[PDB]
Design a protein around this ligand. Structure first.
Ligand SMILES: [Ca+2]
Ligand SMILES: [Ca+2]
Ligand SMILES: [Ca+2]
Ligand SMILES: [Ca+2]
Ligand SMILES: [Ca+2]
Ligand SMILES: [Ca+2]
Ligand SMILES: [Ca+2]
Ligand SMILES: [Ca+2]
Ligand SMILES: [Ca+2]
Ligand SMILES: [Ca+2]
Ligand SMILES: [Ca+2]
Ligand SMILES: [Ca+2]
Ligand SMILES: [Ca+2]
Ligand SMILES: [Ca+2]
Ligand SMILES: [Ca+2]
Ligand SMILES: [Ca+2]
Ligand SMILES: [Ca+2]
Ligand SMILES: [Ca+2]
Ligand SMILES: [Ca+2]
Ligand SMILES: [Ca+2]
Ligand SMILES: [Ca+2]
Ligand SMILES: [Ca+2]
Ligand SMILES: [Ca+2]
Ligand SMILES: [Ca+2]
Ligand SMILES: [Ca+2]
Ligand SMILES: [Ca+2]
Lengths: 346, 346
């Protein structure tokens, strides 16, 4: 009645020109680890075996749900990788229907399975009644969309659902057919509002009713939020998406009163500067990455039991941190704005 | 710049009558896995080696923070185990100061390290100003206490801090010296309010000012909340604490609009029946245990993409689940009360 342990059945194989058509046929959803060939030393061999074991456990856990896992060698299987669109080494590409979803997060069985379980869900969630509306409003650490349509047979709803599939499961798409919900949201019929992460005010997609292409192009242009949360499921995607080799990194434990107070200041600063295309802040809650906390404290020379904020230069592997005597020496929004300005324009 | 990998240094040893005094001296905080001797078959041997490797990784991660890990064989080391108070096999006993903290949760390096990082924090958190007060009010999935005292030198504050140590890190103790915060909480000087998990209304500890013993005895009597959340850090403690071999188990994904709506009904039912000593509901959010979701769906024969609630008989290894056609066929509070009554008084 406990966590599953690998049962030794070989379910994850190398996916190559000989078998790839049969593997895609065997599984309704197929997730492919695109990897460089392991080096020949024993350490690199062991790590490769341990990585495969992670996939084996996930494949066992999800067998009855139509999910399969495979591995594609970027050298041996280069031709198949190209035909399938596998280009970023160490990414897992998830094939659902007509979509190819890139996973670029923690390589662990639990996080992988949680992601696949999100992939298997439908790309549009409905909102009806006050409690469901409250659930929608509680979402803030993701970009989200909500649109008001006549009903599920509306061509405009179907275009919205088709657009949701492009960003699944990263950007939740919500829909309502309830005119009372739409009024509380100030959504006119066939209007779509995009709520950037951590923002209070939405941006309405122009020129409604909107086609799939109009929604997709809009979401792609607003995909990067001023403030974004580092999450295990997407940690490497976020970290690799630096702006001119610079991240602003804020550490704050949401549940701690001092972390909450600092996070509220951070949100206020992001909201007041949300249209500055050069501002990108990563919020890391230490409680989400316990195994990295000592490493971050050593690397950055900071105490993560208190809120911290700094500028990390990925190009030069260097960083500077705002000097805060303790948890009670937090900057005002204005002081935080000014400190970022001083370090960046410099 | 990534998750740590075990470096092969042996930091976790068997703790026995010969070395236990030196181990306790080597480490400021020491966590001891109390385990039955591994069976001699190769499978049991491998599992024991894999368990030790989990401790090795945690010990590496926390080395610079004064934490050590050890293992105590319940047969070979029975005399030392008794002297140290190790009685429940498969529990990890954490020695901090004068306290012995039992860990009875997921045996994984990340969850273990997160718990130890919580252990290392101070047992009382202060509340000052409106934002910190809001952080206090946002806490609902734990029992919590808050007391109003003159200042940190008050003998009554010191008694409160001494009591907090007994329940650290499971039941957060908050304190304020701010008369404006105390007024919003309706806390008179030296009063202590206990907020049961998921309850709106607190219970004031009687006969203030309160001694350590009065607080400890009060908290012990109110320790078990009507509604409690299954969490990795304490999942086995919670599951083993059944009431006459019965758990009421509710599955609800907090972030999903249907899960939120059902959870609100569950909270309302718990609040209206909070004084019924026979009512104990475990809320499991599937998003917290992805690796167990397929196992639960198979074992209970339910769809965990929708909210579910049932009665699980641990004695007879049997369960019954409320029949809900889909996510929109949710019971009212009254219907849920009546359904529990019908299945239990039967
Ligand atoms: Ca294999
Ligand atoms: Ca497409
Ligand atoms: Ca990557
Ligand atoms: Ca986990
Ligand atoms: Ca509007
Ligand atoms: Ca249009
Ligand atoms: Ca990527
Ligand atoms: Ca704090
Ligand atoms: Ca504080
Ligand atoms: Ca913005
Ligand atoms: Ca955590
Ligand atoms: Ca923590
Ligand atoms: Ca403060
Ligand atoms: Ca060892
Ligand atoms: Ca004691
Ligand atoms: Ca136990
Ligand atoms: Ca983890
Ligand atoms: Ca009161
Ligand atoms: Ca008293
Ligand atoms: Ca226990
Ligand atoms: Ca739903
Ligand atoms: Ca619904
Ligand atoms: Ca109660
Ligand atoms: Ca989760
Ligand atoms: Ca989920
Ligand atoms: Ca509903």
């Amino acid at each position: 009645l406990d966590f599953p342990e690998y049962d030794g059945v070989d379910r994850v194989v190398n996916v190559n020109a000989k078998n790839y058509k049969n593997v895609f046929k065997k599984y309704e959803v197929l997730a492919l680890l695109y990897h460089e060939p392991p080096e020949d030393d024993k350490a690199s061999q062991r790590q490769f075996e341990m990585d495969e074991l992670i996939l084996e456990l996930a494949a066992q856990v999800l067998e009855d749900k139509g999910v399969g896992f495979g591995m594609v060698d970027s050298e041996k299987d280069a031709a198949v990788a190209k035909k399938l669109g596998l280009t970023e080494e160490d990414s897992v590409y998830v094939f659902k229907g007509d979509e190819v979803i890139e996973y670029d997060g923690e390589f662990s069985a639990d996080t992988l399975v949680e992601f696949l379980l999100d992939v298997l869900e439908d790309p549009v969630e409905l909102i009806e009644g006050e409690r469901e509306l409250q659930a929608f409003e509680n979402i803030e650490d993701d970009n989200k969309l909500i649109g008001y349509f006549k009903n599920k047979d509306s061509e405009h709803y179907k275009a919205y659902e088709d657009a949701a599939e492009e960003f699944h499961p990263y950007i939740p798409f919500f829909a309502t057919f309830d005119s009372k919900v739409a009024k509380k949201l100030t959504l006119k019929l066939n209007e779509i509002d995009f709520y950037e992460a951590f923002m209070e005010e939405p941006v309405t997609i122009p020129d409604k009713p909107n086609s799939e292409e109009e929604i997709v192009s809009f979401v792609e242009a607003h995909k990067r939020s001023t403030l974004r949360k580092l999450k295990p499921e997407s940690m490497y995607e976020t970290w690799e998406d630096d702006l001119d080799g610079i991240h602003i990194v804020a550490f704050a434990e949401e549940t701690d009163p001092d972390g909450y107070e600092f996070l509220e200041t951070l949100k206020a600063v992001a909201q007041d500067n949300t249209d500055n295309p050069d501002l990108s802040i990563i919020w890391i809650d230490p409680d989400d990455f316990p195994l990295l906390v000592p490493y971050w404290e050593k690397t950055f020379n900071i105490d993560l039991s208190a809120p911290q904020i700094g500028v990390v230069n990925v190009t030069d592997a260097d960083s500077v941190w705002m000097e805060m005597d303790d948890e009670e020496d937090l900057p005002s929004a204005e002081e935080l704005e000014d400190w970022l300005e001083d370090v960046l324009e410099g």
